[PDB]
Design a protein around this motif. Structure first.
Motif, mmCIF file in Angstrom:
data_model
loop_
_atom_site.group_PDB
_atom_site.id
_atom_site.type_symbol
_atom_site.label_atom_id
_atom_site.label_comp_id
_atom_site.label_asym_id
_atom_site.label_seq_id
_atom_site.Cartn_x
_atom_site.Cartn_y
_atom_site.Cartn_z
ATOM 1 N N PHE A 1 6.984 -20.552 -21.094
ATOM 2 C CA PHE A 1 5.856 -19.611 -20.850
ATOM 3 C C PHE A 1 5.589 -18.806 -22.120
ATOM 4 O O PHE A 1 6.338 -17.917 -22.473
ATOM 5 C CB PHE A 1 6.223 -18.670 -19.702
ATOM 6 N N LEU A 2 4.528 -19.123 -22.817
ATOM 7 C CA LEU A 2 4.209 -18.393 -24.083
ATOM 8 C C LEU A 2 3.171 -17.307 -23.831
ATOM 9 O O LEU A 2 2.221 -17.491 -23.103
ATOM 10 C CB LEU A 2 3.664 -19.380 -25.122
ATOM 11 N N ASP A 3 3.351 -16.175 -24.453
ATOM 12 C CA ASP A 3 2.382 -15.058 -24.286
ATOM 13 C C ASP A 3 1.010 -15.531 -24.756
ATOM 14 O O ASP A 3 -0.004 -15.219 -24.161
ATOM 15 C CB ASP A 3 2.827 -13.856 -25.121
ATOM 16 N N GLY A 4 0.970 -16.291 -25.824
ATOM 17 C CA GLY A 4 -0.336 -16.806 -26.341
ATOM 18 C C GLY A 4 -1.164 -17.343 -25.172
ATOM 19 O O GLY A 4 -2.358 -17.545 -25.278
ATOM 20 N N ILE A 5 -0.536 -17.549 -24.047
ATOM 21 C CA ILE A 5 -1.268 -18.041 -22.854
ATOM 22 C C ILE A 5 -2.381 -17.039 -22.527
ATOM 23 O O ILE A 5 -3.457 -17.408 -22.100
ATOM 24 C CB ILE A 5 -0.273 -18.159 -21.684
ATOM 25 N N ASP A 6 -2.133 -15.778 -22.742
ATOM 26 C CA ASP A 6 -3.177 -14.753 -22.463
ATOM 27 C C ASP A 6 -4.408 -15.046 -23.325
ATOM 28 O O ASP A 6 -5.533 -14.922 -22.886
ATOM 29 C CB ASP A 6 -2.633 -13.364 -22.805
ATOM 30 N N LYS A 7 -4.201 -15.435 -24.553
ATOM 31 C CA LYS A 7 -5.355 -15.740 -25.446
ATOM 32 C C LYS A 7 -6.121 -16.937 -24.878
ATOM 33 O O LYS A 7 -7.335 -16.978 -24.897
ATOM 34 C CB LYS A 7 -4.848 -16.074 -26.853
ATOM 35 N N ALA A 8 -5.417 -17.912 -24.374
ATOM 36 C CA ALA A 8 -6.095 -19.109 -23.804
ATOM 37 C C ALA A 8 -7.017 -18.678 -22.662
ATOM 38 O O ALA A 8 -8.083 -19.229 -22.470
ATOM 39 C CB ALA A 8 -5.042 -20.081 -23.268
ATOM 40 N N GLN A 9 -6.619 -17.695 -21.903
ATOM 41 C CA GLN A 9 -7.477 -17.232 -20.776
ATOM 42 C C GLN A 9 -8.823 -16.753 -21.328
ATOM 43 O O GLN A 9 -9.865 -16.990 -20.748
ATOM 44 C CB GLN A 9 -6.781 -16.073 -20.055
ATOM 45 N N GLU A 10 -8.804 -16.075 -22.440
ATOM 46 C CA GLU A 10 -10.072 -15.567 -23.038
ATOM 47 C C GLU A 10 -11.014 -16.734 -23.357
ATOM 48 O O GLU A 10 -12.212 -16.640 -23.176
ATOM 49 C CB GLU A 10 -9.752 -14.805 -24.326
ATOM 50 N N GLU A 11 -10.488 -17.822 -23.853
ATOM 51 C CA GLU A 11 -11.357 -18.988 -24.210
ATOM 52 C C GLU A 11 -11.440 -19.972 -23.040
ATOM 53 O O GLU A 11 -12.043 -21.020 -23.147
ATOM 54 C CB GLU A 11 -10.770 -19.703 -25.429
ATOM 55 N N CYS A 12 -10.846 -19.650 -21.924
ATOM 56 C CA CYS A 12 -10.909 -20.582 -20.759
ATOM 57 C C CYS A 12 -12.362 -21.012 -20.536
ATOM 58 O O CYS A 12 -12.649 -22.165 -20.283
ATOM 59 C CB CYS A 12 -10.392 -19.872 -19.507
#
Ligand SMILES: [Cd+2]
Length: 55
Positions: A1-12
């Motif tokens: 589980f990488l925090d960068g996952i939050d950034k992916a949500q922005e570009e979802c």
């Protein structure tokens, strides 16, 4: 589980329902990719719903 996952949500929205392409960019297993879609309220439901042309 990488925090960068939050950034992916922005570009979802940029990747839309194409979670396969997002997994390749973040190199994450379908588990996190599908989950990001599972959290987005817009991509939660596929297409519209029971409302459409039916006869
Ligand atoms: Cd989304």
């Amino acid at each position: 589980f990488l925090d960068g996952i939050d950034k992916a949500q922005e570009e979802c929205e940029k990747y839309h329902s194409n979670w396969r392409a997002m997994a390749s960019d973040f190199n994450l297993p379908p588990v996190v990719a599908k989950e990001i879609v599972a959290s987005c309220d817009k991509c939660q439901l596929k297409g519209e719903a029971m409302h459409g042309q039916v006869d």
